Structures are given as structure tokens and as C-alpha cells.
């Protein structure tokens, strides 16, 4: 079966370099042209570069030309992307895509995330979003946790050690002007349960080895 | 440079109904136009190659048509799994380009959001920052706008919002908007309000609180 697996993605400071790789299997690699396609947060697919079958020819999108170098090693069944002079705008999921006679991109990898930031690894501060009559509507009360100022992504948020799943909404993270991420996780419960039922958000941030449990009181 | 534009930007489809989305090219590209489906945070997949050729493994309900500058992707009898972003891409001339995408979602009855405003916690205020949260819960369609008002004065540039993907259970969306001010700026004002506009509401709804 045709498979493409990207690797090398991670956190990189602006102006620095990073090399991505794409491991190909289930087909003769040297038969096909290969491409890099990226997707920045809340943006569409952006073609990055193409390399022909034997690596003798390359072409780049205007956004990367002069900064990125596409290459390949046919005996290694590997495609590379050498990225130089990285900028905040380069933050994206980078996909490896097989080219069918320079036509459609028939097979794509899972992608590798590249984060271009000058921010350092930081654990989140967890704040409650307290329920009351003000957060009560039609027999239901809303409460939550604000997971502020962490870097890099992701954070995992569970409620009452994963026992509470109904009425849970964990919002996508937002990148603040500070370069730190922030997210809110909310839960809607019967309004009568406030004062009788305990609600705790379990926040885990793997990159900084941080585990925070916050009691959300009315 | 060949530019691709897709229309509409967003479309809502009822299951079992037919849907046609378009891709327009800046210059003639013949039949060198390909269609892709992409679900949130997932790998894109090829649907139609060279404007009208079905790709191996793609369900028979997907079809493509067009030549030159005008292209169409048709989903005959839409299934729930077809809610995704659809992109077109031209292989006619270098540099290769993609269209901006068309987001297709599941159509359901209009649902107004339940709006709640959360003052900053006392713990956060101690650290010198105040985050005010406006929650818009379980609404349809996806289009919604949040307007922060501080003592009836419309705010700008000091808020950030996040929207969930379409819920697999009830087909609604939820949105959270955070207004961020320093402790000193927060204490200079009394009334904090968030005004929500949505198709499900005849008049925009306002939820507020008094700081003191």
C-alpha cells in the first residue's frame, strides 16, 4: 500500500533552520515527482515545492523561493525540505504529496507540524469560569476553565477525570500577541447540580510536564 | 501566476440532496484542474483528477465537470461524512496553486446561541490580568459575530475568538470570545457586555455584568 510519512517538525526560533523528511513506501519512489504542501492555522492548502523524479529539476512557490530547498534521495525513498530563514508565517502543517505525471497529488502523508516562534516552553495557568444564575438558561448552567499562557501546543482538558463528557466543549487554542497559547474548556450541567456536584478540570501540558487540577466553584 | 477562486465560500447541505460547488481559473487551464477533500486536521484526499476523471476508491456520488476557466464538483445525494473543506488545484502552469476552499457543512434547523458572560476570576486579577469570556453555545448556522462593549463603548482589537468544528451529534457550533485587559485598565470601567448577532436572533442579544 502507498504510504507517505513526514517527520522533523517541531519548535524553531525565527531566522533559524529546520529539515523535514518524508518516508515513502509501497511504490517505486524514483518513478514519481514529489511535492510539499502546507496549511497554516485557519488557512487553506498552499503549494510549497515540487521535485521531479531524479531530482534534476525543482520549482518553488514565491513565498518560499530562495529560502527553502527541496531534495530527494531515491535509494532512501525519502523526500526532504530544508527550511532556512524561518518566519512566524511559516508556522504550518507540512504535507508530503505524490505527484501523478505532474498532474494531481494522488497520495498525501499525515503531515508534520512546524512552529516558528521566539517563545520558550511554558506551563499554563488555569483559571475557573465560575457558574451562577448568570450562566443558567433553560435548566442548564455553564462553567469552565481558562487554560492561559502556555507554549507550545497542545494541552489536554478532561472533566472529573474523564467521567464528565456530556455538555463538554474544548475550544481550539488561540495564539496571543505574547506568542503564548490560550484555550477555554466549558461544560454545561443541570443547574440544580451546582452546590451538590463537584466539577474539576484536569489540565495536562506534556511539553513542560505540567498537571493542574482546578476546582470550579459556583 | 494562475489564480483559482472557489464559489461559494461556505455551503450547507441537507443529507440525500444534490450539491454543486465551483472553481474559477484566472486564465484557461484546459482540463488540468483537480479536486480534494479535507476534514479538520486530517490529510487531504484526491476526489477528481483532470476536471472529470473519478479517482480509484472515490464513491460514485462524486463527479466533476468543466474545461478552460469554469469547473464544477458535484456530490449527488450528500452523505453526513461529506461535510468537509473542498479544494481545487491547477497543474497547468508553474507555480502550482490551490483555490481557497469551500467549506461544506450539514444543514439543520436554525438554532440561536445561548449566550453567557464570565467575569475574570479573583485569582487572575491578583496576577495583574483580566480575561472576560463570552460563550456562544450550540448555534446553527456557523456565522456569528461578537461585539464587546465597555460602559456602552464598542471595543476593537483587544479580543480573540475561537470556534469549534461542526458537532457530530447535533450539527451545531460553539464559539468563545475572550476580552483581555490589564488589572489597571479593567478597574477603570464598571459595565462589561458582549453583544451577539446571529440569524437565529431577531435582535442582537447582550449579556452583561457590573465589575463592582
Q: Give dist(CA A58, CA A101) in Å, integer.
A: 15
Identify all chain A residues contacting B46, using CB atoms and an 8 Å cutoff.
104-107
| B212 CB neighbour count, 10 Å cutoff | 6
Q: In this structure, are residues A62 and B95 in contact, taking their beta carbons and an 8 Å threshold?
A: yes
Cross-chain CB nearest to B95 (options A61, A105, A129) = A61
Identify all chain B residues contacting A60, using CB atoms and an 8 Å cutoff.
95
Burial class of residue A188, CB neighbours in 10 A (0-12, 13-18, 19+): buried
Of B107, B123, B144, the residue that ends a domain is: B107
Q: Give dist(CA A90, CA A110) in Å, integer.
A: 18
State whether B138 and B41 are in the same domain.
Answer: no
The experimental technique used to determine this model is X-ray
Cβ separation B116–A134 shorter than 8 A: yes
> Taking Cα atoms as reference points, which of A86, A91, A97 lies closest to residue A41?
A91
Q: Give dist(CA A14, CA A26) in Å, integer.
A: 36
Cross-chain CB nearest to B174 (options A106, A169, A182) = A169
- The residue segments making up the domain with residue B10 are 1-107
What are the start-end ranges of the H helices in chain A? none
Residue from B93, B95, B112, B194 whose CB has the most chain A CBs within 10 Å, to mutate = B95
Specify the fold of A1-118: Immunoglobulin-like (2.60.40)
Longest dimension (CA), chain B: 66
**CATH 2.60.40.10 in chain A, residue ranges:** 1-118, 119-218
Q: Give dist(CA A166, CA A138) in Å, integer.
A: 16
Q: How many domains is chain B partitioned into structurally? A: 2
> Taking Cα atoms as reference points, which of B153, B156, B160 lies closest to residue B132?
B160
A30-55: buried (b, 16+ CB within 10 Å) or exposed (e) per residue? eebbbbbbbbeeeebbbbbbbbebeb
State whether B100 and B121 are in the same domain.
Answer: no
State whether B144 and B91 are in the same domain.
Answer: no
For B162, list phi and psi in degrees, rounded to 5: -140, 135
Q: What is the CATH number of the domain that holds B189?
A: 2.60.40.10
Cβ separation A138–B89 shorter than 8 A: no
Q: Give dist(CA A178, CA A166) in Å, integer.
A: 33
Q: Give dist(CA A40, CA A92) in Å, integer.
A: 4
Of B107, B132, B149, the residue that ends a domain is: B107
State whether B9 and B96 are in the same domain.
Answer: yes
Residue A36: alpha-carbon gap to chain centroid: 17
For A215, list phi and psi in degrees, rounded to 5: -80, 115
| Domain A119-218 annotated CATH 3.50.50.60 | no
Of B107, B136, B166, the residue that ends a domain is: B107
Residue pairs between chains A and B whose CB atoms are closer than 8 Å: 134
Q: Give dist(CA A207, CA A41) in Å, integer.
A: 20
Cβ separation A45–B114 shorter than 8 A: no
Q: In sequence order, which residues have a C-beta less than 8 Å from that of residue B110 and are 6 or more positions away?
A: B140, B141, B199, B200
The verdict on whether omega for the bond into residue B8 sits within 30 degrees of 0, i.e. cis, is yes
State whether B60 and B136 are in the same domain.
Answer: no
SS (HEC) of B171-186: CCEEEEEEEEEEHHHH
Q: Give dist(CA A80, CA A136) in Å, integer.
A: 54
| A93 CB neighbour count, 10 Å cutoff | 19
State whether B39 and B118 are in the same domain.
Answer: no
State whether B5 and B68 are in the same domain.
Answer: yes
Cβ separation A184–B55 shorter than 8 A: no
Q: In this structure, are residues A189 and A140 in contact, taking their beta carbons and an 8 Å threshold?
A: yes
State whether B62 and B128 are in the same domain.
Answer: no
Amino acid at each position: 500500500q502507498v504510504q507517505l510519512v513526514e517527520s522533523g517538525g517541531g519548535v524553531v526560533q525565527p531566522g533559524r533552520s529546520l529539515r523535514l523528511s518524508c518516508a515513502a513506501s509501497g511504490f517505486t519512489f524514483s518513478v514519481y515527482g514529489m511535492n510539499w504542501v502546507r496549511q497554516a492555522p485557519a488557512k487553506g492548502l498552499e503549494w510549497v515545492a515540487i521535485i521531479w523524479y531524479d531530482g534534476d529539476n525543482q520549482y518553488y512557490a514565491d513565498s518560499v523561493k530562495g529560502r527553502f530547498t527541496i531534495s530527494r534521495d531515491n535509494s532512501k525513498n525519502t523526500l526532504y525540505l530544508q527550511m532556512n530563514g524561518l518566519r512566524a508565517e511559516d508556522t504550518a502543517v507540512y504535507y508530503c504529496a505524490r505527484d501523478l505525471r505532474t498532474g494531481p497529488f494522488d497520495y498525501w502523508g499525515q503531515g508534520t507540524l512546524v512552529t516558528v516562534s521566539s517563545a520558550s516552553t511554558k506551563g499554563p495557568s488555569v483559571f475557573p469560569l465560575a457558574p451562577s444564575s448568570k450562566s443558567t438558561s433553560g435548566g442548564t448552567a455553564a462553567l469552565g476553565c481558562l487554560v492561559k499562557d502556555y507554549f507550545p501546543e497542545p494541552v489536554t482538558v478532561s472533566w472529573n477525570s474523564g467521567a464528565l463528557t456530556s455538555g463538554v466543549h474544548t475550544f481550539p487554542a488561540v495564539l496571543q500577541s505574547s506568542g503564548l497559547y490560550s484555550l477555554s474548556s466549558v461544560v454545561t450541567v443541570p443547574s440544580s447540580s451546582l452546590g451538590t456536584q463537584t466539577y474539576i478540570c484536569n489540565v495536562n501540558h506534556k511539553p513542560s510536564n505540567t498537571k493542574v487540577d482546578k476546582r470550579v466553584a459556583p | 501566476e494562475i489564480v483559482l477562486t472557489q464559489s461559494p465560500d461556505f455551503q450547507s447541505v441537507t443529507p440525500k440532496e444534490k450539491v454543486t460547488i465551483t472553481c474559477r481559473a484566472s486564465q484557461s487551464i484546459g482540463s488540468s484542474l483537480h479536486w480534494y477533500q479535507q476534514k479538520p486536521d486530517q490529510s487531504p484526499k484526491l476526489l477528481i483528477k483532470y476536471a472529470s476523471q473519478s479517482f480509484s476508491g472515490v464513491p460514485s456520488r462524486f463527479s466533476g465537470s468543466g474545461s478552460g476557466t469554469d469547473f464544477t464538483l458535484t456530490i449527488n445525494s450528500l452523505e453526513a461524512e461529506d461535510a468537509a473543506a473542498y479544494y481545487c488545484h491547477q497543474s497547468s502552469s508553474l507555480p502550482f496553486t490551490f483555490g481557497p476552499g469551500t467549506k461544506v457543512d450539514i444543514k439543520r434547523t436554525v438554532a440561536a446561541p445561548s449566550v453567557f458572560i464570565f467575569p475574570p476570576s479573583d485569582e487572575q486579577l491578583k496576577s495583574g490580568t483580566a480575561s472576560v469570556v463570552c460563550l456562544l453555545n450550540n448555534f446553527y448556522p456557523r456565522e456569528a459575530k461578537v461585539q464587546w462593549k465597555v460602559d456602552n463603548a464598542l471595543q476593537s482589537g483587544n479580543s480573540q475568538e475561537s470556534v469549534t468544528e461542526q458537532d457530530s451529534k447535533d450539527s451545531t457550533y460553539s464559539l468563545s470570545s475572550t476580552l483581555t485587559l490589564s488589572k489597571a485598565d479593567y478597574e477603570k470601567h464598571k459595565v462589561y457586555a458582549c453583544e451577539v448577532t446571529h440569524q437565529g436572533l431577531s435582535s442582537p442579544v447582550t449579556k452583561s455584568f457590573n465589575r463592582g
